[PDB]
A and B are shown apart, each in its own frame.
Chain A
C-alpha cells in the first residue's frame, strides 16, 4: 500500500490514507480503506506488504477489543501505540517479519489531547505533530514544516492536508486514486465523505 499521512491539530487527529490497491500492472481497487478502528477514540492507518498489512491491523484490532471487554475500559492512545510497537519489535526478529508501517491517531479522553504516533515495521515509535510513511514524507514534511501551527482548527488541518495531497498528486509518479480522510476527536471517529 502507498500513501498514509497524519496530522495532529488543536483538538483532533486527522489521518489521510490512499484508496488505490495495485497488484502489478493493474489497479484492482480505487476505494480501499487502509485503516482499522482499534477503540472508539483510537484509529490506526497502515501500509506495507500485501496481506501482512490487513492481517496485522485486524490482529491488533482484535487484541485491543479484547482488552476493552475484559477491563470495561478504553486504553490510552499512548498505551495502544506501545502495545503495537512491541508487537512489531517482536516481529522484526521472527522467522517471517510483518512488513507493515502504521500511524496511530488517537484522542486521549483523560488528558483531553489529540495524539499521533508513527511506528515503522522495525518497531520505531515516535510521537509527532504530523507524520507519514514511505515516500509521502519526502514531499509533505516540508509543507507541514512551513504551514503547521499547534493551535490549528480541524478545518485548517483539513485545508493543510488538501495542500499535502495536491502536492503528492502533482509530483508522485503513481496514481494513488485519492485519499480517504478520517478525524479522531473527543466525540470519536468520523469519515470526511467529500475530499
Chain B
C-alpha cells in the first residue's frame, strides 16, 4: 500500500521577546537513519516581517510555506499593498491547514514576527490548524527535550527566591535578544547531544522593527 506521508525529522524553536522575535531550526534533513542533507533550510522569510517554519513531513512543509508566501503576495494585490499583520497571517494559516482537515499537512507550523503594537509574537499551529499566540514554542523531534528547559529558564517555572522557601516566585524579568539567542543555541546543543535526528547546523532568523536578520551556527555532525 502507498503511504503518502513521511518523516523528515528536524526540530524548530520560536521565542517571543519584548520588542523582537526569533525562529530557529536545525538544518539537518533525514529519512529513517540516513542523512539527506546537512544544510537544507527550514525556517523562511515570507515577507512583511514574518518568518515561518512547517516542520515534520518536508513535502507538506514546503507546500504549506509556498502557499502562505503566495497568500502574502495575493493579500498585497487584493488589499492595496497592505502589510499582513502577524495575527492576520496566523488566521490565514489556520484556514490553509483546516482546508486539508481530512488529508492533513503532516506538520507542526510556527510563525514569528511583531504584532501591531511592535511587541514580539510567536504563533503555533497543530496539523489541522488549531493555533494560539505563545511566548515560547519548540516543535518537532526534540520538542520534549527543549520545552521543559524553556519553562524553567524563560518563564522561571518551579523557581522561587532564595530565603523565602517557596513563598515568593522568581520575578518574570524580560530577556534581551543576546540572552534569547544563548538559550536557543544551548537548547539545540542539548537536543543535538541527546537526539539522533538533531545536528549538523542551526539557523536562526531574528525579527526586529529593522527587519529580518540571519545567524548560523555549526552543530555536532554524528
Q: Do chains A and B touch in the complex (CB under 8 A)?
A: no
What residues make up the interface of A, taking CB atoms closer than 8 Å to B? none
